[PDB]
Write a protein that binds this ligand. Structure first.
Ligand SMILES: C[C@]1(c2cc(/C=C(\F)c3ccc(C#N)cn3)ccc2F)N=C(N)S[C@@]2(C(=O)N3CCOCC3)C[C@H]21
Length: 380
């Protein structure tokens, strides 16, 4: 799948996007890859933040669905007009499909000032599509209309001390993007890419919580979120343990809450005082799990645009949640992640591009024996 390697671009903290074309003749747009939503939604009006936008009046293949949609989020929102058009991915499979497109005509706190993307490719399932599950997501249309296999994989390559990159392999797996073996965890339910965490360790020390807390009220894999978000109670325990592990240096309380940065002299970040973080995931077999481990290089994120400082500044990118665990870019930048929809499972392997040092690397290890893993899932 050499044609698709390195087909993702982005800037630190602004997301990973793929080039797409919409309409006839084709209009090229940069589109954020989002496993945490299920709409294909593109700027269609001259918002000043946008490099370009979808001009339906130029497309002979545009079809109006004569239906609008209003999509509010916890902060910000977008509103759009639904239709269909022909869509292709230049550095993807050599096909064209007719897909739903939400033409965004009003938004707030949605587009990012300074970013180079103009829309979002929601790769999750129809149950969470807006306005309802009758709006077929893009990937469903792709698979239905072509012979592309029903899976995709993501290698998100992060940065350290602004340009990120990676690969979205559509319809398969490229073995050059990972080392070791893939380990799979079941997709618990096809809405978000929902998974079940069965154990959490900080530098190998179990947090010893009731594992339902780790998945209250869900745990998901989301390329459209930067942080590792943890349920409030889990975040409290995790930070207590990370604070203790890292206690040879003291930091203001506000740093751990994401309320302020911490800066060090260039090149002197003390990586070794910060612990590794391990999530054990439900395995494929009864009573079997595996673990994924990330480094501070993943969860301490460089902040480049700090005019008021001259040093190397970082943001703590593990944060508390009210929506469950969110394995965002902090997790995904450590791994090659296989969204094996056909077999309702997600594979993890150590990413051949993840950021590490000479002493520690990200890891995917198993098998481990874990009992009562079904009890870890939350039910209303
Ligand atoms: C559509 C939405 C969304 C995402 C985004 C994503 C980004 F801006 C972004 C930025 C940096 C990085 C990195 N590294 C990655 N992504 C930018 C805008 C944006 F809207 N998608 C999400 N995954 S989070 C989101 C949300 O709250 N939900 C809950 C309801 O179900 C769908 C997702 C805000 C939603």
């Amino acid at each position: 799948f050499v044609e698709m390697v390195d087909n993702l671009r982005g800037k630190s903290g602004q997301g990973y996007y793929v080039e797409m074309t919409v309409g006839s003749p084709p209009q090229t747009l940069n589109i954020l890859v989002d496993t945490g939503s299920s709409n294909f939604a593109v700027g269609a009006a001259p918002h000043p933040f946008l490099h370009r936008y979808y001009q339906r009046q130029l497309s002979s293949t545009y079809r109006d669905l004569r239906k609008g949609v209003y999509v509010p989020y916890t902060q910000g929102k977008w509103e759009g007009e639904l239709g269909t058009d022909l869509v292709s991915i230049p550095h993807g499979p050599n096909v064209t499909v007719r897909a739903n497109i939400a033409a965004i005509t009003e938004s707030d706190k949605f587009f990012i000032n300074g970013s180079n993307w103009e829309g979002i490719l929601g790769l999750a399932y129809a149950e969470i599509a807006r306005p309802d599950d009758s709006l077929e997501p893009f990937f469903d249309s792709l698979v239905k209309q072509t012979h592309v296999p029903n899976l995709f994989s993501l290698q998100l390559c992060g940065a350290g001390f602004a340009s990120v990159g990676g690969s979205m392999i559509i319809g398969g797996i490229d073995h050059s993007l990972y080392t070791g073996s893939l380990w799979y965890t079941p997709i618990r339910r096809e809405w978000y890419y929902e998974v079940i965490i069965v154990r959490v360790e900080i530098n190998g020390q179990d947090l010893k919580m009731d594992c339902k807390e780790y998945n209250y009220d869900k745990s998901i894999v989301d390329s459209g979120t930067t942080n590792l978000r943890l349920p409030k109670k889990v975040f409290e325990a995790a930070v207590k343990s990370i604070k203790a592990a890292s206690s040879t240096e003291k930091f203001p309380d506000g740093f751990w809450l994401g309320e302020q940065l911490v800066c060090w002299q260039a090149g002197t970040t003390p990586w070794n005082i910060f612990p590794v973080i391990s999530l054990y995931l439900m395995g494929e077999v009864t009573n079997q799990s595996f673990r994924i481990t990330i480094l501070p290089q993943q969860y301490l994120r460089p902040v480049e645009d700090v005019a008021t400082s001259q040093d190397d500044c970082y943001k703590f990118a593990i944060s508390q949640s009210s929506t469950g665990t969110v394995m965002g870019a902090v997790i995904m930048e450590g791994f090659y992640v296989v969204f094996d929809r056909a077999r309702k499972r997600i594979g993890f392997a150590v990413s051949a591009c993840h950021v590490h040092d000479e002493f520690r690397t990200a890891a995917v290890e198993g098998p481990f024996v874990t009992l009562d893993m079904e009890d870890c899932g939350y039910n209303i």
